Design a protein around this ligand. Sequence first.
Ligand SMILES: *CCC(=O)Nc1ccc(CN2C(=O)N(c3cc(OC)cc(OC)c3)Cc3cnc(Nc4ccc(N5CCN(C)CC5)cc4)nc32)cc1
Length: 275
Amino acid sequence: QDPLLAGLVSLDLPLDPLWEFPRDRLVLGKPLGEGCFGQVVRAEAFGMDQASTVAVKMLKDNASDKDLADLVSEMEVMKLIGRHKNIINLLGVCTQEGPLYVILECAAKGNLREFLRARRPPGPLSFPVLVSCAYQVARGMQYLESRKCIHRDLAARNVLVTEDNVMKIADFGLALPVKWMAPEALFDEVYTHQSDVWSFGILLWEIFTLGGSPYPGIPVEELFSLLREGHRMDRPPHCPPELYGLMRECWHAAPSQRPTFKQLVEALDKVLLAV
Ligand SMILES: *CCC(=O)Nc1ccc(CN2C(=O)N(c3cc(OC)cc(OC)c3)Cc3cnc(Nc4ccc(N5CCN(C)CC5)cc4)nc32)cc1
């Protein structure tokens, strides 16, 4: 569906030597995630002669030309963003023989919401652990921001956790969200780094409720009035007033009066020090 994937015996994509990875240094494995976002499998990559575990995205066997365009586009965007510890990094691509493969870092523990929820108490998710989670995501957003990247969908479901409990921001939209959207984004479809800061506030609340759902009991069509009327979430039980103070600053109606990601990193770093 239709002309490029049906008509071509081979897809003559341009060779980019900086990123091309040999297909025979790759051992494809088990599917990864629930497949909302294309086909992604776990794999072993050799010499990234030590293996290492990676994630590999490819086209579903019924993909359309539009899915082809989206994967290439995602791939091209990730080449320009550059690497950072707290984001899902591009590791390589396979474009020259056979199937298009996009190789990404694997985060073995899944997404941050589920990680938190699984380790809820009846400890594991101590204050220092939660602050560390927040801090790492803020560092990743600070980086993304410095590359002029606006996420637009920052949420704990979109932060992946590696084997070493490193936070890695994923992004499935490089090519439901309403409870994470800044008022300017809801009402006027305006997206800025400051609207990401608002989302980060919602993520902070997610962290300190141990994977709780935002605005419990409130239907998405009402968030509408509520946010305009100045409604904000309350303090999570597992949360010092000072961290709640940060959340609340992130939900300022005025984008200029929300902290910057640089500020959030410095404040969270200081809390971490105090342990
Ligand atoms: C609808 C819910 C859903 O399916 N979510 C989901 C889909 C796919 C993946 C797999 N990915 C992934 O998409 N990553 C990624 C790809 C990409 O393409 C351009 C860009 C990204 O950011 C810019 C990221 C890469 C990646 C890295 N690590 C993991 N790790 C992971 C481990 C375990 C699990 N689970 C295992 C078992 N169970 C029961 C639940 C979850 C999921 C992911 N995945 C991906 C992830 C989520």
